[PDB]
Write a protein that binds this ligand. Sequence first.
Ligand SMILES: NC(=O)C1=CN([C@@H]2O[C@H](COP(=O)(O)OP(=O)(O)OC[C@H]3O[C@@H](n4cnc5c(N)ncnc54)[C@H](OP(=O)(O)O)[C@@H]3O)[C@@H](O)[C@H]2O)C=CC1
Ligand SMILES: NC(=O)C1=CN([C@@H]2O[C@H](COP(=O)(O)OP(=O)(O)OC[C@H]3O[C@@H](n4cnc5c(N)ncnc54)[C@H](OP(=O)(O)O)[C@@H]3O)[C@@H](O)[C@H]2O)C=CC1
Ligand SMILES: N[C@@H](C[C@H]1CC(C(=O)O)=NO1)C(=O)O
Lengths: 320, 320
Amino acid sequence: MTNIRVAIVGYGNLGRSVEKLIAKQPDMDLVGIFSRRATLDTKTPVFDVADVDKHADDVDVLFLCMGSATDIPEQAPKFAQFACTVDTYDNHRDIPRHRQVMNEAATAAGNVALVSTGWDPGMFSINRVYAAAVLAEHQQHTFWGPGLSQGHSDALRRIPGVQKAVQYTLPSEDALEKARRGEAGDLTGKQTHKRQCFVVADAADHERIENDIRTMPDYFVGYEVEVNFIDEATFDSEHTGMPHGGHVITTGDTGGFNHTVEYILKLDRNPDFTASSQIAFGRAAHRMKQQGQSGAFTVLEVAPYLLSPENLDDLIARDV
Amino acid sequence: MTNIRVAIVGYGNLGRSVEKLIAKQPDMDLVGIFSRRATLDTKTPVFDVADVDKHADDVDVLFLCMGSATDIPEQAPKFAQFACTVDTYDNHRDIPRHRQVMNEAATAAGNVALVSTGWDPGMFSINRVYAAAVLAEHQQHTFWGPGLSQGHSDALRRIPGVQKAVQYTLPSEDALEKARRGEAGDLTGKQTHKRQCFVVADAADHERIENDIRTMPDYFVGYEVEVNFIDEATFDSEHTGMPHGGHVITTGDTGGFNHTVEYILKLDRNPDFTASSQIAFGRAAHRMKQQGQSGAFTVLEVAPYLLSPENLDDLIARDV
Ligand SMILES: NC(=O)C1=CN([C@@H]2O[C@H](COP(=O)(O)OP(=O)(O)OC[C@H]3O[C@@H](n4cnc5c(N)ncnc54)[C@H](OP(=O)(O)O)[C@@H]3O)[C@@H](O)[C@H]2O)C=CC1
Ligand SMILES: NC(=O)C1=CN([C@@H]2O[C@H](COP(=O)(O)OP(=O)(O)OC[C@H]3O[C@@H](n4cnc5c(N)ncnc54)[C@H](OP(=O)(O)O)[C@@H]3O)[C@@H](O)[C@H]2O)C=CC1
Ligand SMILES: N[C@@H](C[C@H]1CC(C(=O)O)=NO1)C(=O)O
């Protein structure tokens, strides 16, 4: 009767965080990890991503943890055919297309696919919509960092020549304070964030790599970008942590009265929080299937209570 | 296009706030105000609350704005038989009961009743359940203010000699900082908030009044209190407003990694923001009725997109 049979697809940072965190769940059993690699450092059973079809009946929801920049678009739709799915796809300009192709696959299989979960997209997306809906007349801005962005970091490593790479998003603190006072209108995220890259690569490949970085669509174009090529020794010791966070600020006026809505996240480890978010929506995905639903849904489409491990009545009697 | 026809029951501060705000809604038409009083200071049509049945067909959703104390529990169910209803009922300990009773009336009439909307019962409820869901093991606290506490203000006003008074509940800056780092597990309610009083009275009574305040049990004893005796002119110009707000702070450890989720609300006028929320949910109740649902629902059971005046598609392409 109880217990969601879960499985991870892609054993990177995010993949390792969801494996770790499934242990804190009272209703989930990790059945295994589907990977492109043969030897993983874990006691959890490893399967070939190609043998997913063979495990279709013993898995309720697959947690997609492959790279957004190149893996998700091509691979994601494939898995929706075998079980419910949850991803953290973050290329915003590509979300409507992704939602459509995942809906096709999920609807045909009778499954539920929760797309673009996490904190951004994910929690920040939900907040943007709530604050904007409530405050008719409003101004809204999202700030990231300072911290390590997993999507931009992975995008850098797919560039040939890049041995090791990491990217930090640096927000304009000046603009963040202006937002709080409702005086940052017309200012965009591309204008309030700097992107600094720390890359380890052969000197000969520098020019090319730098070109591919500054011209990469969505992740980098239109942003101020600093590229640093550093010694591998310095990399392995200075760039090991994965902190991050952000602020979604919304101000509104009701006729001579201002209101400020602020959602803040201070994450010690980006992979871990993202993984916690993904797991919660994994629970909702499954519950939605149990109730007769199918297709791809964004975070804006699931009622909040579906994420909780506790039943509705307990939440209504304690948290409302 | 179609345009949702709305009516306001009860014309207090909340009712006044929803009235002026509907003018800002792109899809709502105000049909009238159902009041117990015949002559209101407004251009909008006023109708006897006993004649709601006579207008049952001219209205889509009724914004219930009477007092929570006694009005909502006895009157609210009766209105649910005429149209969709939205209330901001804040008696936390009575919510499960109010929901069950409203669900009986709403289901019978085939309507949708959205109960307990607003900011604490409302936005804060949504956030509590969200952050608690995501962060498996966690600590959670909610702080109110700075804001005018009617309960404590009234305690101040019944002191002999007090001409005018008001009390502001402020969050302890020390306590907020501790909750942010997950160190507030041992803090008591008398340690999480400070109390600031503004009393107008003859100087001859200042010493006795200050003592009456500082020793008043259940309201100020054990708390850190601040008393200020101001001029009546300073009172009328600076303490007639209705500010409020609060902080919802949640933390969680993921294996030596801490995460902080903080939701902040700074409101210049309490009833104005409450009205904004109540209105957004009125749109949601109407859309839910169009989709074939009925019965009563809390803010935890409605999907975020349902509150927005935009198309789901525009939302997905722009805010996710
Ligand atoms: N929406 C949101 O708020 C958030 C989204 N994200 C997203 O998370 C995604 C994942 O980032 P992250 O997990 O840190 O990236 P990693 O590069 O660490 O993991 C990516 C993929 O690379 C593979 N791989 C991993 N290690 C190696 C290795 N050592 N040698 C060769 N191949 C390897 C994996 O597949 P395999 O094991 O099969 O080989 C893994 O699935 C990003 O694309 C980003 O978009 C992250 C945070 C938040
Ligand atoms: N959930 C949340 O976050 C929040 C909830 N609340 C809730 O909303 C409610 C707000 O009501 P609010 O408008 O502040 O209170 P009021 O006392 O101003 O209004 C209450 C009722 O009294 C009546 N009445 C109003 N003015 C007068 C008058 N001058 N003379 C005599 N009768 C009058 C009205 O009915 P009629 O017109 O029929 O006479 C009105 O419906 C509260 O009860 C509270 O529970 C408020 C803020 C936030
Ligand atoms: N998508 C991000 C999560 C947040 C952080 C971010 C950025 O720094 O630009 N954008 O969104 C990630 O993969 O880590």
